[PDB]
Amino acid sequence: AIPAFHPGELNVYSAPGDVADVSRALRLTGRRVMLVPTMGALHEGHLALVRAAKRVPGSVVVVSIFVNPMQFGAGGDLDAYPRTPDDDLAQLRAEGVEIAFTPTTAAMYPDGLRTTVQPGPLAAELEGGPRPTHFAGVLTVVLKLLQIVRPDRVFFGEKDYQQLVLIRQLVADFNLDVAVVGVPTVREADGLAMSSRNRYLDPAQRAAAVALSAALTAAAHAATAGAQAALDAARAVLDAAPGVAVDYLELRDIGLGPMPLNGSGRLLVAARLGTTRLLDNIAIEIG
Amino acid sequence: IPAFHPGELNVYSAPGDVADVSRALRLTGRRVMLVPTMGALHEGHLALVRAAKRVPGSVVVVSIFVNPMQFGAGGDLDAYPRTPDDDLAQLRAEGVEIAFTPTTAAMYPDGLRTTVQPGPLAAELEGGPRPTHFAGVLTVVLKLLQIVRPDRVFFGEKDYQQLVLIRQLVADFNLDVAVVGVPTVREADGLAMSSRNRYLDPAQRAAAVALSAALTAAAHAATAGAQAALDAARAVLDAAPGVAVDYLELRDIGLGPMPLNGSGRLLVAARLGTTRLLDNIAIEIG
Ligand SMILES: CC(C)(CO)[C@@H](O)C(=O)OP(=O)(O)OC[C@H]1O[C@@H](n2cnc3c(N)ncnc32)[C@H](O)[C@@H]1O
């Protein structure tokens, strides 16, 4: 028997088998299953993905909420990760979402870490520098969510651009039959990319943090003058801010391969303000 | 959808073609059965085909692909037997409707990029001296499963460690497919059928009966305990001319981090000249 599903209401399932059964039953009834993977503690950045999924005609939106231990580091603080279950579900209800998948760690990893996904070399670069096992954790849990839910489309934010690219690699490499949809980064009024981490910044740091987005947008417009001008413009803006320790500032092609001297690319930056690591990236057209 | 002639063998090399045909079939109620092979088909493979064909309303897809990723350099990939024409003739005689024969470029357009990392079992037994072998096997099987999306996938008990690792892959990645293990097909004297038996000269072929004789002796000696079972197999293997044992181990059936307790699997690997043969058998202790 298929678990109960009440249309127009937020239906919450914790068991993988239950959401798999409902999802399959719904796809047979004329719905297109949209999957929005998250780790909860939802904000407007996450809701933008929700809205993108909801607009697809015939959509039934599945939002997964699961703090994935595998992507935290030997030094990542899993226990400290924000958990606001009640408020998250309230936001999903307000958004018209019909399915929330909230599994336990034991349900996702009943046999602990055994078979896992090993990403390509891109996983060791950029964010993979300080967190070399992070993306293996992300790809492993995303592959599982994709097999459990079997969505028609899965949504990821351009906020985590390297994550998005690695998911496209996972999908191509494993011949997965799902469409990956990237959603533009939601930003605060001054341009700061929305993140739960922004609240950790003190006033001086919050003002200095504007430099990441301002450096990227400056570079995007300086790009008519070439790659080097775009990079130098971005560095100049970051250099005008106090207490911003840049970990990297790199211009790559859109698939994160070598910096192009012409055409489309992506400029990515990561920096530390006190103990808070912030990231941002932007589309760049060279020339 | 590419052309599909029911009741005849349809051969597709493009992943997209077999994926489209499989999907269309599943949408019309047929249940898709997948039998992965590396070709050089013999009766062992045909038992998997027949197991698949007996499932009601089934359409059988046999993949034939000598997967480069599961070979370690050293001429092994080039030395693997290839008998394309006989393989397809056999599939036709069995009434198989789909043969999926992809190219290396279609399967690995980006070389080795995202891959499957198996659990610890992959570093043991067959994996001990071939550390990347099972990552190669699990990566290609995961791809084949995503391309064909079968309701059930068939594997022989002959490669028992491989079968166990595939069950781990399916459970660990929440794959919606049933894994069916098929009993080992043997020659009249007990020799497990293998595409590698063709490399045994007459003398070696005669001596090779020792692996199955040792295992079956052990299975019956086991009423007297594990030590009795293992010593009986060792005696048979030691009486065999020209058989060099690589390993002979008795494990819990999951081959996992669990001690042997009642139901086990006895596995053996041995070399006759340059030919490495494997065999295994279910064992019940006491
Ligand atoms: C994929 C996960 C769920 C795997 O555990 C995990 O790695 C994860 O990323 O979770 P999480 O941090 O919860 O983010 C979930 C999704 O929301 C997107 N997102 C976050 N802030 C955003 C913003 N300001 N604008 C647009 N999109 C934004 C992320 O890029 C990601 O696709």
Ligand SMILES: CC(C)(CO)[C@@H](O)C(=O)OP(=O)(O)OC[C@H]1O[C@@H](n2cnc3c(N)ncnc32)[C@H](O)[C@@H]1O
């Ligand atoms: C899974 C593959 C296709 C991935 O490349 C590859 O690793 C592979 O295993 O190829 P291959 O050697 O072609 O074996 C294909 C399948 O037939 C089974 N098989 C072989 N000899 C058998 C016998 N005598 N009785 C019963 N089943 C037998 C194997 O265990 C395996 O599942």
